[PDB]
Structure formats: C-alpha cells, structure tokens
C-alpha cells in the first residue's frame, strides 16, 4: 500500500563544494606506473 506522509517539508537545495570527488575507474584495463588522459563523464573539481 503506497502511503504518503502527512507533513513533508519542501526540500532545501543547499549548496556545497565537491573538491576532488567522483573519480572512478573508467574501464577494466590494468595500467601501471603511468599518466593517462581520459575523456569521459566526470564530476568536475570544485
């Protein structure tokens, strides 16, 4: 039974700063001891 709630407050949408997060392994390739330029979907810094 899908049930709503009585007095849900509106969301706040407050602002914060993501410094260096969201970096992930873009593929399934092992690479060692190297620098590598990717073009993909990333959370940009700050």
């Amino acid at each position: 039974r899908c049930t709503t709630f009585d007095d849900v407050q509106a969301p706040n949408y407050t602002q914060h700063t993501s410094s260096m997060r969201g970096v992930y392994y873009p593929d399934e390739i092992f690479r060692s001891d190297t620098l590598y330029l990717t073009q993909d979907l990333f959370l940009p810094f700050y």
């Binding site: 392994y25 399934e28 390739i29 092992f30 690479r31 060692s32 001891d33 190297t34």
Partner: protein
C-alpha cells in the same frame, strides 16, 4: 571451443576478445578483481 594453455612458446592466441600472436608467460601484475586485461605505456 577451448584448448590448453601453451606457455613460453610463440603461439597464436585467442582469449575472450583478444587475438594476436605472442609468447605467454605468468606474471605478477596485481590486477584488481574487475580488470580483465592490461596495457603497456603505449596502447
């Protein structure tokens, strides 16, 4: 199909998605459990 693994001999290999000729030998590269294969400093 599927065959045995010939090592230390120039063979024509076909892994799951990787083809070519070369010499197969065991190694100590520490793959992560989600890393199917590796690459050199080139491509």
């Amino acid at each position: 199909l599927s065959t045995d693994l010939i090592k230390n001999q120039c063979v024509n290999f076909n892994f799951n998605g990787l083809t070519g000729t070369g010499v197969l030998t065991p190694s100590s590269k520490r793959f992560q459990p989600f890393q199917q294969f590796g690459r050199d400093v080139s491509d």
